[PDB]
Chain length 303, copies 4
């Protein structure tokens, strides 16, 4: 397959995916009801844009991507012609197969942790593409989305594509019951899904686990993958101690195996943001990012 066709390519969750696929070297086409600066930018980058929906817009497409949600003549034409029609969320999840993917999973804290990771990686000069709220970003980037080696993405356990993400590194911030309905209303089935998620890591991958959560601590011995734990717990690999405040800024000292203690600060209050920073610190440490870029990335994040 070489040509991907987006139905509604100007949508806020669609244009970013099309831009990465252009960056990856694919032929990209898309239709929309109105030309916009979004479709003009995509066209400048090589996308073929159709205004209006008609069956012929899907001619030649190898796969269709359709908006979160079917009588549409492009879709109907693709089905009758046995062209696969994939939902937006699946194509988004698939982008991780082309990059060094960092999946930020857990029921709470994904958005902040993803942003903190992006901020530290940016401070180290790596310009990562990142996914928050289903939207691809690259902060102040001067390039097509997806240009960086790194893709940092929220992994939502309620998303149909959860068990199809192929990350190199995965965080589990915590395991709550918000999305029990996704798994038959059974919290134990939800827990097993996190184990299966972590087993999509390759044996050389890394699982970053918050052991302050008793549910994470419970599934920890089932993860037959390399693991680094973090939290305030005395037995966490990467720990925060001596937590203090100076204004709206929280300071703490981070302990890491075989490293000197490092003082960091973060511009947001609450232990949950200390934990989000610890997760970030584990990932940046494992990736080899300097202490200065870590301090700069955490300290400069607004919110």
């Amino acid at each position: 397959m070489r040509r991907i066709h987006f139905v509604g390519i100007g949508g806020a969750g669609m244009c970013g995916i099309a831009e990465v696929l252009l960056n990856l070297g694919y032929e990209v086409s898309g239709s929309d009801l109105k030309a916009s600066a979004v479709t003009e930018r995509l066209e400048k980058f090589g996308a073929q844009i159709f205004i209006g929906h008609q069956a012929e817009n899907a001619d030649g497409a190898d796969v269709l991507v359709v908006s979160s949600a079917r009588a549409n003549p492009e879709v109907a034409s693709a089905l009758e012609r046995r062209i696969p029609v994939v939902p937006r969320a699946e194509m988004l999840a698939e982008l991780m197969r082309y990059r060094h993917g960092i999946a930020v999973a857990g029921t709470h804290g994904k958005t902040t942790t993803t942003s903190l990771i992006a901020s530290v990686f940016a401070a180290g000069g790596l310009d990562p593409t990142f996914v928050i709220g289903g939207r691809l970003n690259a902060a102040g980037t001067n390039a097509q989305l997806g240009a960086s080696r790194y893709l940092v993405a929220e992994a939502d356990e309620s998303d149909a594509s959860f068990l199809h993400l192929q990350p190199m590194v995965a965080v589990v911030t915590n395991i709550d019951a918000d999305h029990m309905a996704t798994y038959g209303g059974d919290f134990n089935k939800l827990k097993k899904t996190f184990v299966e998620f972590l087993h999509n890591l390759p044996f050389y991958g890394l699982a970053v686990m918050c052991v302050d959560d008793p549910v994470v601590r419970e599934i920890l011995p089932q993860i037959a993958r390399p693991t680094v734990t973090y939290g305030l717990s005395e037995d966490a690999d990467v720990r925060a101690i001596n937590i203090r405040q100076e204004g709206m800024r929280t300071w703490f000292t981070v302990l890491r195996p075989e490293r000197e203690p490092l003082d960091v600060s973060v511009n947001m209050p609450g232990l949950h943001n200390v934990l989000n920073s610890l997760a970030t610190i584990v990932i940046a440490t494992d990736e080899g990012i300097s202490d200065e870029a870590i301090v700069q990335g955490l300290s400069g994040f607004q919110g």
Copy 2:
């Protein structure tokens, strides 16, 4: 992770995996009770071999691989130091991430279809590594296992690693009830697992589906991946007609989209071996392999 340690590296299912990891560039060590030509070959290829089991043999290992079978001192030492221990079957499934993987799934016909695929690819000069019965082979190869771009492997729905295979192409020969116990004794759960398996294909991947099976035909509209169907069914993409016998040899004409009809023969009787050949023909055609190599591989496979 860089050093993989095999406990019982001389085993028939272990030595092949160790050889591929050596071919992939990893540090490989392994212990065994007896030195043999198998451990000498692994040592010639760069493995570090220990005879006898003692805890120190696992020093420095980043991951342990243990036989489909825990009091062992190397295992106990690895657990105490939080080194992941993965079963033989899981490391085997993981090899597909490094290669152009062809997963031959289905309840019946996996062994023959894999062998025919290997035989056709071999005839085209591609020397594939292939997995039948959990043993890695490359036929008459003059090289380390895994040297080819291609890895062709049986994908068994009863294997715990089934949903962790990451193939480029997947066959489903048929869906039977043999392994219902793996899925709570529920055939409908078993069917859903084949759908989830096919969704591990990337959007550019290929699903090769035998539509003569009513169960395969049922799940076909759920496969949101590129698909080629085969069988004797009049509506299959790739079909066999004019089936005849001349000795113990079965002849038939294969019809393929946008190709002229091609006469082939196979040295085994029964419509099930026609179907095994059709699956092979679909995969070889999609890979660009010549008619000559297809004819030669199929006719030259003994049994």
Copy 3:
């Protein structure tokens, strides 16, 4: 080789090379007489910085890079231990082996053509790294130098590394006599060097030749590589017609094989800048860049 050591890493021509090697994944160290924001940025990205020159700074280095120009104790230590010491210009030329290299050669017009190419590639979202005056740039980049797939570099026939560049695409704007002394004061030897330079392209490479120059036209039949010619000559593949001025802006229509005529403008006068733009248009066209990015890149270049 894994550790590269720069003697005088803070210099304006050294820091850029060190940053790209960091981006490529190498261990990079460097010494300098004074810490500066340049060395602090390099340290943030993973460089090990030494202040002051002492023999031990070179310990562990696999290669040393020294500034354009031996009594230095780091150099002397490396020579005594048979570590290679490569000049800045050679390490710079070597960066092209890791990227899609575009070598802008010719006696005149290298700086402007390199800048125009970078500007058009930037407009297409490709954020190229480019080398003008021996200095690596990525204009308004949010990343380490070298992050882009593309490296656009002046290729100076007076540089000792000229015949060691390994580009994917090479321009020859013109062949003048400025640097005859490099070649024994013999213009015919200088012409032969341009032929040998173009033969460092791979057979899949591209030579972009300005046939308005009679010297380029002379060596053209000797280039056994894919070639696209440009200029005002009636027989050029890519030509400029209908040249006009409106202010300090020059307008013209570009003819390209199998394309519709395209109107462009450039914010600098003179036929030499029409030619610089034609070279840029040939490279952008062959790389697949849209007409809109070409028009925007050329029109937005100040000077």
Copy 4:
């Protein structure tokens, strides 16, 4: 460029090159006066074969390869259409760009040293493709030529493509005056060409230098590339001592930096074959090949 057309593809020096290009994924066509088993094998592997020479055989070709030397209508058609026509030897030299290239240079000993290297790499399971006498081989291979990661080739200083080889590792066995005519009949110009040859290595490359030759010893300080020296000289990095005979077999002890002494034997007499063996040992050691494979590769080479 994607389609390469061979004029005389069945010739002994052409078919091997076409097979590697097929293995690399290119479209390959070729013409010849007679069908043979050689053209049938190429056709089985995906080559398009034309019988007879007519201009139309060159249609669609991006480059033509012609045997070791124009009235041919395919050549004339290509020249008239500005399709590059490259000689067999230049395309052969270019294959090294796709592989881990080992260039065996020096006036004497190239054929034996190449065969010994290939023999040792084969014993280590690497099935290398190698070039002796302008012919591509892979010994008893079950695969297309070029399938291995490694390409081992004689580098002849009289070959027009000498300074266009892009090896990762280069041997210089000795520098004699046989080919002074290639270099204006000036031995000093010949010496300088070997220096330029070694500078085509990248800074991470390796030069393997026989310092028993005083000419090699003379140019050694000009090689600003990683270097390992070998020979009987007391100051060589890798040395042979205790040379003895047992039958028609020559035994000696090889000393290597930071390794225990290793006894090896070879089936051919003369110090020149000790030197050919030392060169092989340097390359195999640097590539990480086990002592067992070295001993087996050297001991099993017939002659």
